[PDB]
XYZ file of N, CA and C in Angstrom:
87
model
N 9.177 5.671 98.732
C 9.953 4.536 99.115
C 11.373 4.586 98.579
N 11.713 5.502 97.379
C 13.117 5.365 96.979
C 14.206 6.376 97.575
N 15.185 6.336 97.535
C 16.096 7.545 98.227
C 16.446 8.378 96.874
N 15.466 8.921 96.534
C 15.400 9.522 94.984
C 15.650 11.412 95.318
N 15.705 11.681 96.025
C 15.161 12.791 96.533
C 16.734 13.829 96.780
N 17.476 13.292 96.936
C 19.230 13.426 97.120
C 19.403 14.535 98.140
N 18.462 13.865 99.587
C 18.535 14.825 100.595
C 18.380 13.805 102.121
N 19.271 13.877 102.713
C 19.066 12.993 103.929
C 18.496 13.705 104.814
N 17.838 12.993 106.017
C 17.307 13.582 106.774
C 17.979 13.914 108.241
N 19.437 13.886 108.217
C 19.753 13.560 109.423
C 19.305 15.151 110.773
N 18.855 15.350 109.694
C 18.564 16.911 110.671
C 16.760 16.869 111.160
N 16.485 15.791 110.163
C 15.275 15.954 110.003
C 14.205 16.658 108.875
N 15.054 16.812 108.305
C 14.537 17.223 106.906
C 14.495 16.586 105.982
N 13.544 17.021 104.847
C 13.476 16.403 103.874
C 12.292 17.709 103.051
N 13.029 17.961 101.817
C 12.271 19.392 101.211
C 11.656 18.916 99.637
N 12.152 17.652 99.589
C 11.540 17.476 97.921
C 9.833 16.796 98.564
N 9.047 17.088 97.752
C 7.918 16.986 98.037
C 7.195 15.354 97.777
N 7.169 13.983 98.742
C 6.819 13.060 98.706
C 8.342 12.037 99.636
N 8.749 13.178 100.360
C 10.464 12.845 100.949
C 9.828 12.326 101.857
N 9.827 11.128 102.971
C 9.718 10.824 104.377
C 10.876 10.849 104.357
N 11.439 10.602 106.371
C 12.393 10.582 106.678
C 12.792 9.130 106.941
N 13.340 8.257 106.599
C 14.014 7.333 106.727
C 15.395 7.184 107.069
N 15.549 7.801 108.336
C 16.755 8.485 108.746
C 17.751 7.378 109.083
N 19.087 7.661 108.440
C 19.645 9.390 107.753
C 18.959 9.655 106.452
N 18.372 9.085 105.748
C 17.918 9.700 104.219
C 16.375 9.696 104.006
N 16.447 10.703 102.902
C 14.875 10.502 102.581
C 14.736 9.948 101.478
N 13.413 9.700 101.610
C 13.362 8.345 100.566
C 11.349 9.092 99.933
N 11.681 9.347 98.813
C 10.234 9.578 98.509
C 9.654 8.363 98.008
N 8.352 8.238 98.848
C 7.506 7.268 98.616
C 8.299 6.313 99.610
């Protein structure tokens, strides 16, 4: 749930492990 992860998703990614995409950012958990 937090944008802890310091990786957005605007590509669709997200590489830290617990990242969803909450696009543009990921947010683990």
């Amino acid at each position: 749930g937090l944008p802890v992860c310091g990786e957005t998703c605007v590509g669709g990614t997200c590489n830290t492990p617990g990242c969803k995409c909450s696009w543009p950012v990921c947010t683990r958990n």
